Amino acid sequence: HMTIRVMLQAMDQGHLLVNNVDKYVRAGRGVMVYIAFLSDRDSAPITDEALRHAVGVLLHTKIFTHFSPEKMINQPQSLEECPEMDILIVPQASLGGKVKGRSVQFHQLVAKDVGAALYDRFCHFVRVARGVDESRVDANGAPRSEGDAPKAEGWIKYNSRVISGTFGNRQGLRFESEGPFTHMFDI
Amino acid sequence: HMTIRVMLQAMDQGHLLVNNVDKYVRAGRGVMVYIAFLSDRDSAPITDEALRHAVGVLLHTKIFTHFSPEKMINQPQSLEECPEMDILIVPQASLGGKVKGRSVQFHQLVAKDVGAALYDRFCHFVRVARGVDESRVDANGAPRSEGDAPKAEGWIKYNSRVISGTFGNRQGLRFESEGPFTHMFDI
């Protein structure tokens, strides 16, 4: 079977480069997701029911403790129970890399076009589960009107965003966290 | 057997909170390493030869392509062949977390004192392999004289640093990357 590998970090602020040059899209407080789609030579392909299952694990699992600073007692919470948290998704296929002698081999990584399709589908499902108005956002989940985009510098509030990297691009990143509390799940 | 899980990211700049409040230590270009020590109930304890082996994997493997921007043709390079790159080590035991229903269980994580000992020993071996003058640095690998510390803001050059988080603290982070190219190795 095919594995969806994710690395999940507690995000306070993020900036992700989307055009390989100098255009960054922004997220506030929530979760930064690194994702890779992995495969055996003889593994069956990832269906929609399996992709949606993986989104459910991402959203339904109580993982992070930083969403609700106003809470008297902090417990792990799901993204689902905190609908306003932002999600920033970065394709990181290199998560499937393994050491081979003194180099790295990427034989577990799905082919480019398969990964592009799964990545696109996965970002769509997350947008839908977070109630994103897909007619008001661009390919990276940022506003279609540049005048609605968050300010370029200085702290911004979360706003139920689902921001995603441009597949196949260099994922230039600025990331701020009060404590990443990094999780790694194979799904 | 026990496992040293590491997540490795291409670092341009990093700031790591070391006192739970407002003191940050700095790294320039190199690699940011998240580390967890994992175990079965019936697994043997990690020896010094196995810790050193793990350091060898981190330093000898050609992984990253961002160390030498002056190179006409960029190939993966080892940290070993680029002695001036900085290393920023963050304890992230949560990497051993697994989904259990709608929560996370941490049953694979070594005990606190075992992890403290392995973490300390691992940071020591990295310092040694990078030629750090251990008499001129503090517990986090920053200068012992506060006047030799890098400037607090603005770009800084790499300088063969081995910076490491305070074990058991909250790992407040600011991270900049031209493309994290994230790897995940179980060693």
Curated annotation (Swiss-Prot), chains A, B:
Molecular function via GO: D-aminoacyl-tRNA deacylase activity
Keyword Secreted: no
Pfam family name, one: Tyr_Deacylase
Keywords: Cytoplasm, Hydrolase
Main location: cytoplasm
Coiled coil: none
GO cellular component terms, A-Z: cytoplasm
Domain of life: Eukaryota
Assembly with partners or alone: Homodimer.
Family: Belongs to the DTD family. Highly divergent.
Function as written in the Swiss-Prot or TrEMBL entry: May hydrolyze D-tyrosyl-tRNA(Tyr) into D-tyrosine and free tRNA(Tyr). Could be a defense mechanism against a harmful effect of D-tyrosine.
Matches recorded under PANTHER family: D-AMINOACYL-TRNA DEACYLASE 2, D-TYROSYL-TRNA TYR DEACYLASE
Protein name (record): Putative D-tyrosyl-tRNA(Tyr) deacylase 2
Biological source species: Leishmania major
Organism lineage string: Eukaryota, Discoba, Euglenozoa, Kinetoplastea, Metakinetoplastina
